[PDB]
Design an enzyme around this catalytic site. Structure first.
Site, mmCIF file in Angstrom:
data_model
loop_
_atom_site.group_PDB
_atom_site.id
_atom_site.type_symbol
_atom_site.label_atom_id
_atom_site.label_comp_id
_atom_site.label_asym_id
_atom_site.label_seq_id
_atom_site.Cartn_x
_atom_site.Cartn_y
_atom_site.Cartn_z
ATOM 1 N N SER A 94 -0.355 15.414 -12.118
ATOM 2 C CA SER A 94 -0.578 15.012 -13.488
ATOM 3 C C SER A 94 -0.802 16.250 -14.350
ATOM 4 O O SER A 94 -1.366 17.244 -13.893
ATOM 5 C CB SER A 94 -1.782 14.060 -13.576
ATOM 6 O OG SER A 94 -2.181 13.889 -14.916
ATOM 7 N N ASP A 124 0.831 -1.186 0.000
ATOM 8 C CA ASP A 124 0.000 0.000 0.000
ATOM 9 C C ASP A 124 0.872 1.244 0.000
ATOM 10 O O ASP A 124 1.334 1.673 1.065
ATOM 11 C CB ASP A 124 -0.918 -0.014 1.229
ATOM 12 C CG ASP A 124 -1.823 1.205 1.315
ATOM 13 O OD1 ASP A 124 -1.893 1.961 0.328
ATOM 14 O OD2 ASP A 124 -2.504 1.366 2.367
#
Length: 330
Positions: A199, A35
């Site tokens: 992004s 994770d």
């Protein structure tokens, strides 16, 4: 040193991935959920409330000659989906794919929430975010990667998640055979303890690329792709019959639909998520309404590049003094 381990989807939907981890002496092998969105290594154990164990493999520290109770240490964690766990702490030898850390904090669950009990395939979590998020008190503990880092050939690990298929976590090296083209690196902020990056935009299907900054985290521990409501609306508008359902808890679409791809930008590079990756199947057994793999992050407080996104790429988690993230197509 290096390590290399295969990671395997827990079910036919890729809801999560498990990776075998050797704990203790002799080895006790548990299948953990790696994770990159949390920083605790915790396991189902001999200490876990018996009614809260249903099929998991447990760590039994008393059977490990290298296990030592970390005196006074406790842990307690809550995840973004509302699940939780807590317990006490041992140190022990932990090996992943041939890579061994001694004195790793192994957090032994005394309590887990129902979601964990109900998932018999996940024996615990191995956190790979920054150690600043680690919940051990009163002495915060380091992640497996942090402990391994100095020993690694290169201070990196990589995530190569499969679509409906096994993949690989590598530690200490970049497998140049595992991706196509080049790896594009992008800056990381550790300010929130996550692999947080920006992004450069997105496209829906064959549509034109929209240049726009999307701050989010690279999180192998989250199944879906969570993006701003504007983006997600733009995506599902291209799917006839798709709608946001409050009763279901997100966008659903007719199972008869062919989904468009979704592209996200990494600097000047582009990662394409095939439409099939965004299908998470019937909302309930036999239903013709299917759950969408791209959902709104509104009300989460952060955008999450979960498995839906990450499995479309070869992802480098660069833990150099200045961390970065790298993405390549594959």
């Amino acid at each position: 040193s290096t390590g290399s381990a295969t990671t395997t989807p827990i079910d036919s939907l890729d809801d999560a991935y498990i990776t075998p981890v050797q704990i203790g002496t002799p080895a006790q092998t548990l299948n953990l959920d790696f994770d990159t969105g949390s920083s605790d290594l915790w396991v189902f154990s001999s200490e876990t409330t018996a009614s809260e164990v249903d099929g998991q493999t447990i760590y039994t520290p008393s059977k490990s000659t290298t296990a030592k109770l970390l005196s006074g240490a406790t842990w307690s964690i809550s995840y973004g989906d509302g699940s939780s766990s807590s317990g006490d702490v041992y140190t022990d030898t932990v090996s992943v794919g041939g890579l061994t850390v001694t004195g790793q904090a192994v957090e032994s669950a005394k309590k887990v929430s129902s979601s964990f009990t109900e998932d018999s395939t996940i024996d615990g979590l191995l956190g790979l975010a920054f150690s600043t998020l680690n919940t051990v008190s009163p002495t915060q503990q380091k992640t497996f990667f942090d402990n391994a880092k100095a020993s690694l050939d290169s201070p990196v690990f990589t995530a190569d998640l499969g679509y409906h298929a096994p993949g690989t976590y590598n530690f200490g090296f970049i497998d140049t055979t595992a991706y196509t083209g080049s790896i594009t690196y992008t800056a990381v902020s550790t300010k929130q303890g996550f692999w947080e990056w920006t992004s450069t935009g997105y496209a829906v299907g064959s549509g034109t690329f929209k240049s726009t900054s999307i701050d989010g985290i690279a999180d192998t521990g989250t199944t879906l792709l969570y993006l701003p409501a504007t983006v997600v609306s733009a995506y599902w508008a291209q799917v006839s019959g798709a709608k946001s359902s409050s009763s279901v808890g997100g966008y659903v679409f007719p199972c008869s639909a062919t989904l468009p791809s979704f592209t996200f930008g990494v600097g000047s590079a582009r990662i394409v998520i095939p439409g099939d990756y965004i299908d998470f199947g019937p909302i309930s057994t036999g239903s013709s309404s299917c759950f969408g793999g791209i959902q709104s992050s509104a009300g989460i407080g952060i955008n999450i590049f979960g498995d839906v996104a990450l499995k479309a790429a070869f992802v480098v988690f660069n833990g150099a003094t200045t961390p970065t993230l790298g993405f390549a197509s594959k």
